[PDB]
Design a protein around this motif. Structure first.
Motif, PDB file in Angstrom:
ATOM      1  N   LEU B   9      43.304  37.089  35.380  1.00 24.96           N
ATOM      2  CA  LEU B   9      42.654  35.783  35.512  1.00 24.96           C
ATOM      3  C   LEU B   9      41.425  35.560  34.671  1.00 24.96           C
ATOM      4  O   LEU B   9      40.723  36.504  34.311  1.00 24.96           O
ATOM      5  N   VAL B  10      41.152  34.275  34.408  1.00 19.73           N
ATOM      6  CA  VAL B  10      39.952  33.719  33.795  1.00 19.73           C
ATOM      7  C   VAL B  10      39.681  32.486  34.645  1.00 19.73           C
ATOM      8  O   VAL B  10      40.611  31.735  34.908  1.00 19.73           O
ATOM      9  N   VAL B  11      38.480  32.388  35.235  1.00 18.64           N
ATOM     10  CA  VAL B  11      38.119  31.346  36.207  1.00 18.64           C
ATOM     11  C   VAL B  11      36.714  30.813  35.914  1.00 18.64           C
ATOM     12  O   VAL B  11      35.862  31.574  35.495  1.00 18.64           O
ATOM     13  N   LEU B  12      36.471  29.514  36.109  1.00 14.95           N
ATOM     14  CA  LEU B  12      35.123  28.971  35.952  1.00 14.95           C
ATOM     15  C   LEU B  12      34.400  29.226  37.276  1.00 14.95           C
ATOM     16  O   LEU B  12      34.826  28.761  38.344  1.00 14.95           O
ATOM     17  N   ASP B  13      33.346  30.034  37.196  1.00 14.89           N
ATOM     18  CA  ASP B  13      32.536  30.365  38.345  1.00 14.89           C
ATOM     19  C   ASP B  13      31.354  29.404  38.373  1.00 14.89           C
ATOM     20  O   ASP B  13      30.509  29.425  37.475  1.00 14.89           O
ATOM     21  N   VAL B  14      31.354  28.512  39.373  1.00 12.38           N
ATOM     22  CA  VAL B  14      30.298  27.517  39.622  1.00 12.38           C
ATOM     23  C   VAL B  14      29.356  28.225  40.622  1.00 12.38           C
ATOM     24  O   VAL B  14      29.678  28.322  41.815  1.00 12.38           O
ATOM     25  N   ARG B  37      31.786  32.406  33.034  1.00 17.72           N
ATOM     26  CA  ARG B  37      33.200  32.717  32.791  1.00 17.72           C
ATOM     27  C   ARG B  37      33.591  33.927  33.677  1.00 17.72           C
ATOM     28  O   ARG B  37      33.221  35.067  33.383  1.00 17.72           O
ATOM     29  N   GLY B  38      34.285  33.633  34.772  1.00 16.84           N
ATOM     30  CA  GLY B  38      34.723  34.601  35.771  1.00 16.84           C
ATOM     31  C   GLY B  38      36.149  35.092  35.623  1.00 16.84           C
ATOM     32  O   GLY B  38      36.713  35.042  34.530  1.00 16.84           O
ATOM     33  N   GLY B  39      36.714  35.590  36.723  1.00 18.24           N
ATOM     34  CA  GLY B  39      38.037  36.205  36.753  1.00 18.24           C
ATOM     35  C   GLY B  39      37.890  37.674  36.396  1.00 18.24           C
ATOM     36  O   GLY B  39      37.149  38.015  35.462  1.00 18.24           O
ATOM     37  N   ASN B  40      38.583  38.560  37.134  1.00 18.10           N
ATOM     38  CA  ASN B  40      38.463  40.004  36.948  1.00 18.10           C
ATOM     39  C   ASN B  40      38.724  40.497  35.505  1.00 18.10           C
ATOM     40  O   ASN B  40      37.787  41.036  34.888  1.00 18.10           O
ATOM     41  N   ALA B  41      39.931  40.278  34.940  1.00 19.69           N
ATOM     42  CA  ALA B  41      40.186  40.726  33.562  1.00 19.69           C
ATOM     43  C   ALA B  41      39.226  40.095  32.527  1.00 19.69           C
ATOM     44  O   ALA B  41      38.855  40.749  31.542  1.00 19.69           O
ATOM     45  N   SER B  42      38.782  38.850  32.798  1.00 21.40           N
ATOM     46  CA  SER B  42      37.837  38.110  31.962  1.00 21.40           C
ATOM     47  C   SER B  42      36.444  38.757  32.015  1.00 21.40           C
ATOM     48  O   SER B  42      35.835  38.945  30.955  1.00 21.40           O
ATOM     49  N   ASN B  43      35.965  39.140  33.234  1.00 21.77           N
ATOM     50  CA  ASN B  43      34.672  39.808  33.448  1.00 21.77           C
ATOM     51  C   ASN B  43      34.678  41.182  32.750  1.00 21.77           C
ATOM     52  O   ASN B  43      33.708  41.536  32.067  1.00 21.77           O
ATOM     53  N   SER B  44      35.811  41.919  32.864  1.00 20.91           N
ATOM     54  CA  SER B  44      35.997  43.213  32.199  1.00 20.91           C
ATOM     55  C   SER B  44      35.903  43.074  30.669  1.00 20.91           C
ATOM     56  O   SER B  44      35.321  43.946  30.015  1.00 20.91           O
ATOM     57  N   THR B 251      25.734  40.756  42.876  1.00 20.71           N
ATOM     58  CA  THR B 251      26.908  41.661  42.872  1.00 20.71           C
ATOM     59  C   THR B 251      28.208  41.005  42.334  1.00 20.71           C
ATOM     60  O   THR B 251      29.274  41.637  42.397  1.00 20.71           O
ATOM     61  N   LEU B 252      28.132  39.762  41.806  1.00 24.46           N
ATOM     62  CA  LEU B 252      29.310  39.073  41.272  1.00 24.46           C
ATOM     63  C   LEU B 252      29.797  39.729  39.964  1.00 24.46           C
ATOM     64  O   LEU B 252      29.121  39.664  38.933  1.00 24.46           O
ATOM     65  N   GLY B 253      30.950  40.369  40.023  1.00 27.17           N
ATOM     66  CA  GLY B 253      31.496  41.040  38.852  1.00 27.17           C
ATOM     67  C   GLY B 253      31.060  42.484  38.668  1.00 27.17           C
ATOM     68  O   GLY B 253      31.330  43.073  37.622  1.00 27.17           O
ATOM     69  N   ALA B 254      30.402  43.081  39.674  1.00 25.36           N
ATOM     70  CA  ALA B 254      29.970  44.477  39.633  1.00 25.36           C
ATOM     71  C   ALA B 254      31.180  45.424  39.535  1.00 25.36           C
ATOM     72  O   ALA B 254      31.183  46.330  38.701  1.00 25.36           O
ATOM     73  N   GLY B 255      32.206  45.167  40.348  1.00 25.87           N
ATOM     74  CA  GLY B 255      33.458  45.922  40.373  1.00 25.87           C
ATOM     75  C   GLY B 255      34.208  45.842  39.058  1.00 25.87           C
ATOM     76  O   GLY B 255      34.792  46.826  38.619  1.00 25.87           O
ATOM     77  N   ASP B 256      34.154  44.679  38.399  1.00 21.31           N
ATOM     78  CA  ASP B 256      34.772  44.485  37.086  1.00 21.31           C
ATOM     79  C   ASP B 256      33.976  45.231  36.001  1.00 21.31           C
ATOM     80  O   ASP B 256      34.582  45.691  35.036  1.00 21.31           O
ATOM     81  N   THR B 257      32.639  45.364  36.186  1.00 20.24           N
ATOM     82  CA  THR B 257      31.704  46.103  35.320  1.00 20.24           C
ATOM     83  C   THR B 257      31.985  47.610  35.478  1.00 20.24           C
ATOM     84  O   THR B 257      31.995  48.348  34.484  1.00 20.24           O
ATOM     85  N   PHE B 258      32.234  48.048  36.733  1.00 21.34           N
ATOM     86  CA  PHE B 258      32.589  49.422  37.047  1.00 21.34           C
ATOM     87  C   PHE B 258      33.916  49.742  36.295  1.00 21.34           C
ATOM     88  O   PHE B 258      33.928  50.590  35.406  1.00 21.34           O
ATOM     89  N   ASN B 259      35.000  49.012  36.620  1.00 21.39           N
ATOM     90  CA  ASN B 259      36.318  49.189  36.040  1.00 21.39           C
ATOM     91  C   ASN B 259      36.295  49.253  34.526  1.00 21.39           C
ATOM     92  O   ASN B 259      36.843  50.202  33.976  1.00 21.39           O
ATOM     93  N   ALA B 260      35.632  48.290  33.856  1.00 25.93           N
ATOM     94  CA  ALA B 260      35.560  48.224  32.395  1.00 25.93           C
ATOM     95  C   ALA B 260      34.797  49.377  31.783  1.00 25.93           C
ATOM     96  O   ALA B 260      35.197  49.868  30.729  1.00 25.93           O
ATOM     97  N   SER B 261      33.699  49.812  32.432  1.00 28.70           N
ATOM     98  CA  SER B 261      32.892  50.945  31.969  1.00 28.70           C
ATOM     99  C   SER B 261      33.644  52.271  32.124  1.00 28.70           C
ATOM    100  O   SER B 261      33.502  53.135  31.260  1.00 28.70           O
ATOM    101  N   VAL B 262      34.441  52.423  33.217  1.00 29.11           N
ATOM    102  CA  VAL B 262      35.289  53.601  33.495  1.00 29.11           C
ATOM    103  C   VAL B 262      36.356  53.656  32.387  1.00 29.11           C
ATOM    104  O   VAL B 262      36.554  54.719  31.796  1.00 29.11           O
ATOM    105  N   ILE B 263      36.988  52.501  32.072  1.00 26.86           N
ATOM    106  CA  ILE B 263      37.991  52.391  31.009  1.00 26.86           C
ATOM    107  C   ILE B 263      37.332  52.729  29.675  1.00 26.86           C
ATOM    108  O   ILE B 263      37.887  53.520  28.928  1.00 26.86           O
ATOM    109  N   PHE B 264      36.166  52.135  29.380  1.00 26.01           N
ATOM    110  CA  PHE B 264      35.416  52.363  28.143  1.00 26.01           C
ATOM    111  C   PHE B 264      35.163  53.853  27.898  1.00 26.01           C
ATOM    112  O   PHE B 264      35.547  54.362  26.838  1.00 26.01           O
ATOM    113  N   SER B 265      34.576  54.557  28.897  1.00 30.94           N
ATOM    114  CA  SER B 265      34.262  55.982  28.810  1.00 30.94           C
ATOM    115  C   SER B 265      35.513  56.830  28.597  1.00 30.94           C
ATOM    116  O   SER B 265      35.515  57.714  27.734  1.00 30.94           O
ATOM    117  N   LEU B 266      36.584  56.543  29.355  1.00 32.67           N
ATOM    118  CA  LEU B 266      37.838  57.273  29.215  1.00 32.67           C
ATOM    119  C   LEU B 266      38.454  57.009  27.857  1.00 32.67           C
ATOM    120  O   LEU B 266      38.820  57.965  27.178  1.00 32.67           O
TER     121      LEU B 266
END
Ligand SMILES: O=c1[nH]c2ccccc2nc1C(F)(F)F
Lengths: 301, 296
Positions: B9-14, B37-44, B251-266
Motif C-alpha cells: 500500500l501507499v496511503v495519504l496520511d492526514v 505519504r503513508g502505507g507500509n511498503a511506501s513508508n519502508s 510512533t506512526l511508521g516505526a514498524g515500517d522503519t524497523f522492517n526497512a532497516s532490518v532489510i537494509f542491514s541484511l
C-alpha cells in the motif's frame, strides 16, 4: 475577470477541510481501524453561506485566510465547483490551512471532533483595506477577530457615507460562538444574526427572550435575527414589532450540518432581493428546513 | 541486481497532532496538521531511500490530485514509481491519523477505496534482474503466493551469487495471510498477529510460529518498547533491546522503519544480530521525531 458594479454578496470568515469518517465503534488509542465511509467536505460558516447563495442564484465571493498547499487546492476547487468567486482570499505565507477531523460512531451517532490548529492568521483590517468594495451590494461578516472586524465594518460605514442610498452596501454580522470579544459586533451591521448557543450562554431561554434582551446592543435602525432550531426563527426591527416564522421540518432529518448557514444566507438573499424581514424569515426557514432532509447542499432549491 | 522492491500500500496520511487523546463525544483542538505519504511498503521506501538504498515501489494508485502529491513525494525521495500498477476504477486510499504528542501513540482510521490490489498479472510484467531484494506486505495472500512462486522460479535459474532475497510482512491478524509464513528468507510477524494467536512475548511467538516458515528462513518479531527478537535455522534466539528516545513523540511508521532497516542491514550482508539491532536503532530515532526527516 470583470464583475459588474454592486452585483456580488461577500462572505468574510472561515473555510476548513473537514474529513468525516463513519465508524462501527469508537477507536481505542493506538489502534489501526477501517471506517465504513469517509467524506472530504468544505466547511466553515462564511464558506457554507457562499455555497447556498450560489445555489440560490446569487453572484457571490468568499474572503478568508488560506495558505498555499494541497488543502487550499481541494477547498478552492470545491468553492469553484459551487460557483464561488475566490479572488478575495487572503493568502498567508505562514500557517496551516484549517482542517478538522471528525469521527461518527455508526452505533450511538455521537460526534468526536479534533479541531483545526490555531496557526493560520485571521483576515486583518489591512488585508480588508485592499478590497475595492464597489462590486458588492451586501457584505456579510462571520464574527471571529472582533477588534479587526470592527475596523473593516467602520470602513464599510465610511464607504457608505459618500454613496447615494441606492449605492449603499448592506451589511450583516454573525455572532455564533459564545466568546465575550465578539459581543461588540452587535453594534455593527444593518442585520445581526445571533445563535441559540450565544443566547443560551447569555442567559436567554428563547428567541423572544434573546431578541428583547439584546436589541439594545444594536446600531440605530438594525434588525436582530435569531433561529431557534425546531422553534423557527424570530426577527426584531427598529419598530419594536417581534416577527416570527415557524420551522418547516423535513419528512425525516438527514443532515443538520450547515442549517444555520443556510438560514443566514437565505435571509441575506431575500433581503438583498428587496423582500420584507417577514418574507425573509419565512424564506430562511423554508430553505434551512429543506436542507435538513438532505445530505449536503445538493437540491436545497 | 541493485534495487530493493517493496510491494504493498501507499496511503495519504492526514495527521493531527494532539496533546491528549480525545474523549468520545469530546471536542479537542490539535497542535499541528500535516499530510504524509503513508502505507507500509511506501513508508519502508522512505526509510530505504533515506539509508542510501536504491529502491522501488509497486502498488495500486488512482490518477488524481492525491496521487500527484504521493508521486511528488516518492520522486522527492528517489523512489522508482515505474512499477506502479495504475488503476482506473476508484480513488487513492486515505486515512485519519491522530498522533498523541505526550506518548507518541498513533490512532489510524483508514478509508480503503476498493482499489483493485496488485495482481500476479501486474507482477509478471516486472523485470526481476534489477532487484537485490523483494519485500511483500501481506494483503491479497492467494494472489501474492503466485508472485512469491514466480520469484523462487527465477532463483532456481540463477547462481547463489545472483539470487533475489525475499522478505514477507504479516501485520494484520487475517487467516488468509498465514500461508505467506511460508515463503521468503525473512518473515516479519507483528506483535498484534502474535497476540491474536495466544503468545504474550516475542520469544513465545517465535518458538511457536517457526515451524510455519520456509527451510532456512529467519522469523522476526519486533515488540515495541520490549525490543525485537529473531530465530533462524540454528534454533538460537536473537534479541535486541530497544533504543527509546527520552521523549517518544511519533510512533506512526516505526514498524515500517524497523522492517526497512532490518532489510537494509541484511541486504548489506551484516548478521541477523547486527540487523535486529539496527532496526531497533532506526525505529527508536524515528520515534523521537515527527515524520522521517532526520532519522539519519
Ligand atoms: O515505540 C516504539 N515502537 C517500535 C516499534 C517497532 C520497533 C521498534 C520500536 N521502538 C519503539 C521505542 F520504544 F523505541 F520507542
Amino acid at each position: 475577470g470583470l464583475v459588474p458594479r454592486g452585483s456580488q454578496i461577500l462572505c468574510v470568515g472561515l473555510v476548513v477541510l473537514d474529513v468525516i469518517s463513519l465508524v462501527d465503534k469508537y477507536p481505542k488509542e493506538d489502534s489501526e481501524i477501517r471506517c465504513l465511509s469517509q467524506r472530504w467536505q468544505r466547511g466553515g460558516n462564511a464558506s457554507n453561506s457562499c455555497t447556498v447563495l450560489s445555489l440560490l442564484g446569487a453572484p457571490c465571493a468568499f474572503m478568508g485566510s488560506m495558505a498555499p498547499g494541497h488543502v487550499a487546492d481541494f477547498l478552492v476547487a470545491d468553492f469553484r465547483r459551487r460557483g464561488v468567486d475566490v479572488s478575495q482570499v487572503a493568502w498567508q505565507s505562514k500557517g496551516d490551512t484549517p482542517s478538522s477531523c471528525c469521527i461518527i460512531n455508526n452505533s450511538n451517532g455521537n460526534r468526536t471532533i479534533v479541531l483545526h490548529d490555531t496557526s493560520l492568521p485571521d483576515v486583518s483590517a489591512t488585508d480588508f483595506e485592499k478590497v475595492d468594495l464597489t462590486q458588492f451590494k451586501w457584505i456579510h461578516i462571520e464574527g471571529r477577530n472582533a477588534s479587526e472586524q470592527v475596523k473593516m465594518l467602520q470602513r464599510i460605514d465610511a464607504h457608505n457615507t459618500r454613496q447615494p442610498p441606492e449605492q449603499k452596501i448592506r451589511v450583516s454580522v454573525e455572532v455564533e460562538k459564545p466568546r465575550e470579544e465578539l459581543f461588540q459586533l452587535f453594534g455593527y451591521g444593518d442585520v445581526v444574526f445571533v445563535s441559540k448557543d450565544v443566547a443560551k450562554h447569555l442567559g436567554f431561554q428563547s428567541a423572544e427572550e434573546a431578541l428583547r434582551g439584546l436589541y439594545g446592543r444594536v446600531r440605530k435602525g438594525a434588525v436582530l435575527v435569531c433561529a431557534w432550531a425546531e422553534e423557527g426563527a424570530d426577527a426584531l426591527g427598529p419598530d419594536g414589532k417581534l416577527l416570527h416564522s415557524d420551522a418547516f421540518p423535513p419528512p425525516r432529518v438527514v443532515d443538520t450540518l450547515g442549517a444555520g448557514d443556510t438560514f443566514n444566507a437565505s435571509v441575506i438573499f431575500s433581503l438583498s432581493q428587496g423582500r420584507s424581514v417577514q418574507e425573509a424569515l419565512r424564506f430562511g426557514c423554508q430553505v434551512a428546513g429543506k436542507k435538513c432532509g438532505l445530505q449536503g447542499f445538493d437540491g436545497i432549491v
